[PDB]
Amino acid sequence: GDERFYAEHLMPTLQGLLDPESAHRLAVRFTSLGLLPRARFQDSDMLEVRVLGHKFRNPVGIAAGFDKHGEAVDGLYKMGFGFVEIGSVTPKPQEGNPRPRVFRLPEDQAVINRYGFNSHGLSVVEHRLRARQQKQAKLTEDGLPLGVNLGKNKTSVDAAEDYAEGVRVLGPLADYLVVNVSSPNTAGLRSLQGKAELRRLLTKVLQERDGLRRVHRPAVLVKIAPDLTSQDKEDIASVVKELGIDGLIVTNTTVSRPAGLQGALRSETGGLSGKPLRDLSTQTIREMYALTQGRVPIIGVGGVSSGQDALEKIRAGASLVQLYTALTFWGPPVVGKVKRELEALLKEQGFGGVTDAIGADHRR
Numbered sequence: 001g002d003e004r005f006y007a008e009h010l011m012p013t014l015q016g017l018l019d020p021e022s023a024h025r026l027a028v029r030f031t032s033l034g035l036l037p038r039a040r041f042q043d044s045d046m047l048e049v050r051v052l053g054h055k056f057r058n059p060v061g062i063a064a065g066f067d068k069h070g071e072a073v074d075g076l077y078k079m080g081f082g083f084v085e086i087g088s089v090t091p092k093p094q095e096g097n098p099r100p101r102v103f104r105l106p107e108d109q110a111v112i113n114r115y116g117f118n119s120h121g122l123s124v125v126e127h128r129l130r131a132r133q134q135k136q137a138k139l140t141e142d143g144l145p146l147g148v149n150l151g152k153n154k155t156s157v158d159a160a161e162d163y164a165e166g167v168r169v170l171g172p173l174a175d176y177l178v179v180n181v182s183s184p185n186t187a188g189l190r191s192l193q194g195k196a197e198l199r200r201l202l203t204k205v206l207q208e209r210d211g212l213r214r215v216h217r218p219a220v221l222v223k224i225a226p227d228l229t230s231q232d233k234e235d236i237a238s239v240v241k242e243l244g245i246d247g248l249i250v251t252n253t254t255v256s257r258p259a260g261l262q263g264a265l266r267s268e269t270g271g272l273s274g275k276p277l278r279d280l281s282t283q284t285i286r287e288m289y290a291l292t293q294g295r296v297p298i299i300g301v302g303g304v305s306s307g308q309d310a311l312e313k314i315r316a317g318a319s320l321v322q323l324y325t326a327l328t329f330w331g332p333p334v335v336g337k338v339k340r341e342l343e344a345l346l347k348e349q350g351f352g353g354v355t356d357a358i359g360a361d362h363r364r
């Protein structure tokens, strides 16, 4: 493939022929089949990162949402991602919201989605991952970890138990689990970010995680929204420290609509991703890093489309970064682009490697 070809011809043509959701489905299909452009870039030692009890070949991963049901994990590693996160997965299967539920904002290099946790359910995903469990074991040992993002059912009467079930069912198959309490498309989900409820919720999740056999015991991270108040962030940092949460994913999509959006569909209900979210996410990473005294690993997500975007989040405190929306606009070549640009910037700024740059802004 070619970065310019995909950005100017292939992707534009695809988006002109298929609606957003159909384009996504096709994307998952092609990826699962390995129909991807040549992954030129060769990961250098400079990009290697050790965190969350694992080695990561490179710090660029695919964010949750692209492979909700764990159907294209291997194809995603082939695309060049240093780690893959599937999900969110709900206990029981559910359809999500009616279509259309995803919209492109071309003029803003953004997307708005309100899928509503469409999920094949824990059982289906469980067997899908078991079919390649040993293959993943080798991938992980080779520096390509797998993360599993857990969600809750729309009609659930016990949010905590939904997450507990996810820990028990998919925890044994993941390197890290994500307690996603930041989806803007699930009524009352974000309220789980409150201190009182959060502590109770995470205490239960951690107990279930600790109850798994050693080799099947994943790290547990909490994914937060970019729309939290200063009080919310202080509370989350406090609870994370109190319970020993392994890490944070910052951030999910935003329900805010920054001044300046041009897309005709800017007022659609849902979470906004892409460039308009980038700096709000970076600043959230910066604050959480400071609140946790840089002792809690952070996976930075939100508007990453270049090496500069990645490095800004790393310097702000992220040990790893993820992207999704950039892929929807530029295609597979964007992964290699980000890694190549990141490597060059690290050298240009005097960093021996990614590890040396983590939280660098806080030390100046």
Ligand SMILES: Cc1cc2nc3c(=O)[nH]c(=O)nc-3n(C[C@H](O)[C@H](O)[C@H](O)COP(=O)(O)O)c2cc1C
Residues within 6 Å of the ligand: 063, 064, 065, 066, 068, 087, 088, 102, 111, 113, 115, 117, 149, 180, 223, 251, 252, 253, 273, 274, 275, 277, 301, 302, 303, 304, 322, 323, 324, 325, 326
């Ligand atoms: C279409 C779509 C679906 C998503 N689904 C999920 C999900 O199921 N779980 C989750 O934790 N985040 C989900 N996200 C959020 C992304 O993981 C990420 O936090 C956010 O989009 C910011 O990254 P980006 O600007 O690179 O897309 C989704 C995002 C998009 C655009």
Ligand SMILES: COc1cccc(-c2ccc(NC(=O)c3ccsc3C(=O)O)c(F)c2)c1
Residues within 6 Å of the ligand: 010, 014, 015, 019, 020, 021, 023, 024, 025, 026, 027, 028, 030, 031, 035, 036, 037, 102, 104, 111, 327, 328, 329, 331, 332
């Ligand atoms: C042969 O070339 C390839 C190979 C492998 C994957 C893709 C591809 C195609 C479309 C999307 N796009 C989305 O998956 C998407 C998600 C939510 S919206 C939206 C979109 O197009 O607007 C992609 F990420 C990757 C193209």
Ligand SMILES: O=C(O)c1cc(=O)[nH]c(=O)[nH]1
Residues within 6 Å of the ligand: 065, 088, 113, 114, 115, 116, 117, 118, 180, 182, 183, 184, 185, 252, 253, 271
């Ligand atoms: O499934 C969705 O609608 C969804 C979940 C989530 O966590 N984030 C997002 O942007 N959409």
